[PDB]
Amino acid sequence: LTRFPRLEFIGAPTPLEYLPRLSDYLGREIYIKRDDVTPIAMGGNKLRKLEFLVADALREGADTLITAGAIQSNHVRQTAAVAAKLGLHCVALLENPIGTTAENYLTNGNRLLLDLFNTQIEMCDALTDPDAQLQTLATRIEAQGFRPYVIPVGGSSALGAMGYVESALEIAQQCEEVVGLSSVVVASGSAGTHAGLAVGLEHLMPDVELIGVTVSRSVAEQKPKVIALQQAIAGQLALTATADIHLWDDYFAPGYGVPNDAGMEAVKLLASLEGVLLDPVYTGKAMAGLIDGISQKRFNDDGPILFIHTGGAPALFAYHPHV
Amino acid sequence: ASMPLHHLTRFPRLEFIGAPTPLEYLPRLSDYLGREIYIKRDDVTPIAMGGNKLRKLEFLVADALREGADTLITAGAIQSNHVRQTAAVAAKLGLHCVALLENPIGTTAENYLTNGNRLLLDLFNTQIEMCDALTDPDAQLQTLATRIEAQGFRPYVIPVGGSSALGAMGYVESALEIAQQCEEVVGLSSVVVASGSAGTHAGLAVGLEHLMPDVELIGVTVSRSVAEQKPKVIALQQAIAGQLALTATADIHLWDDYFAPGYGVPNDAGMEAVKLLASLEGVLLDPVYTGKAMAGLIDGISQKRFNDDGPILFIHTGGAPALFAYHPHV
Q: Is the dihedral of CA A47, A48, A52, A53 positive or negative?
A: negative
Yes or no, beta carbons of B115 and A317 under 8 Å apart: yes
Interface residue of A116, A120, A279 to substitute, partner B, most B CBs within 10 Å: A116
Strands B96-102 and B127-131: parallel
Question: In degrees rounded to 5, what are phi and psi of residue B231?
Answer: -55, -40
Closest of B142, B140, B139, B210 to residue B171, by C-alpha: B210
CA pair distance A197, A166, nearest whole angstrom = 8
CA pair distance B87, B285, nearest whole angstrom = 22
Residues 6+ apart with CB under 8 A from B242: B165
Residues of B with active-site annotation: 80
CA pair distance A103, A125, nearest whole angstrom = 18
Measure the CA angle with vertex B191, ends B187 and B219; round to 5°. Answer: 165
Question: In degrees rounded to 5, what are phi and psi of residue B212?
Answer: -135, 75
- Å between B280 CA and nearest CA of chain A: 6
3-state SS string for chain A: CCCCCCCCCCCCCCCEEECHHHHHHHCCCEEEEECCCCCCCCCEHHHHHHHHHHHHHHHCCCCEEEEEEECCCHHHHHHHHHHHHHCCEEEEEEECCCCCCCHHHHHCHHHHHHHHCCCEEEECCCCCCHHHHHHHHHHHHHHHCCCCCECCHHHCCCCCCHHHHHHHHHHHHHHCCCCCCCEEEEEECCCHHHHHHHHHHHHHCCCCEEEEEECCCCHHHHHHHHHHHHHHHHHHCCCCCCCCCEEECCCCCCCCCCCCHHHHHHHHHHHHHHCCCCCCCCHHHHHHHHHHHHHCCCCCCCCCEEEEECECCCHHHHCCCCC
Q: Report B:108-137 residues touching A (Cβ under 8 A).
A: 110-111, 114-116, 119-120, 123-125
User: What is the layout of strands, in order, in the sheet containing B96-102?
Assistant: B127-131, B96-102, B71-77, B155-157
B81 touches chain A (CB under 8 A): no
List for chain B the helix, strand, coil content (%; round to 5).
45, 15, 40
Interface residue of B43, B97, B115, B181 to substitute, partner A, most A CBs within 10 Å: B115
B46 touches chain A (CB under 8 A): yes
Yes or no, beta carbons of B328 and A12 under 8 Å apart: no
User: Resolution, in Å, please?
Assistant: 3.3
Residue B168: strand, helix, or coil: coil
DSSP type of residue B7: G
A chain contacts of residue B109, beta-carbon cutoff 8 Å? none
CA pair distance B113, A73, nearest whole angstrom = 25
Closest of A311, A42, A256, A7 to residue A149, by C-alpha: A7
Yes or no, beta carbons of B92 and A41 under 8 Å apart: no
Residues 6+ apart with CB under 8 A from B246: B4, B7, B8, B206, B210
Q: What was the structure determination method?
A: X-ray
CA A22, A24, A27, A31: dihedral to nearest 10 degrees? 50
Question: Among A116, A272, A318, whose Cβ lies nearest the Cβ of B275?
Answer: A116
Residues of A with active-site annotation: 73
Interface residue of A38, A174, A268, A317 to substitute, partner B, most B CBs within 10 Å: A317
Contact B320, B45 (CB under 8 A): no
Question: In degrees rounded to 5, what are phi and psi of residue A273?
Answer: -105, -20
A chain contacts of residue B116, beta-carbon cutoff 8 Å? 317
**CA B43 → CA A15, A19, B36, B39, distances in Å?**
16, 22, 21, 11
**CA B301 → CA B208, B228, B287, B312, distances in Å?**
22, 25, 20, 10
CB-side neighbour CA atoms (13 Å) of B280 = 16
B323 touches chain A (CB under 8 A): yes
DSSP type of residue B91: H
CA pair distance B249, B193, nearest whole angstrom = 20
A198 touches chain B (CB under 8 A): no
B18 touches chain A (CB under 8 A): yes
Residues 6+ apart with CB under 8 A from B113: B78, B103, B107
User: What is the layout of strands, in order, in the sheet containing B190-195?
Assistant: B23-25, B37-41, B312-316, B190-195, B216-221, B253-255
CA pair distance A169, A319, nearest whole angstrom = 34
CB-side neighbour CA atoms (13 Å) of A6 = 20
Domains annotated for chain B, with CATH where assigned, are: 1-51+162-330 (3.40.50.1100), 52-160 (3.40.50.1100)
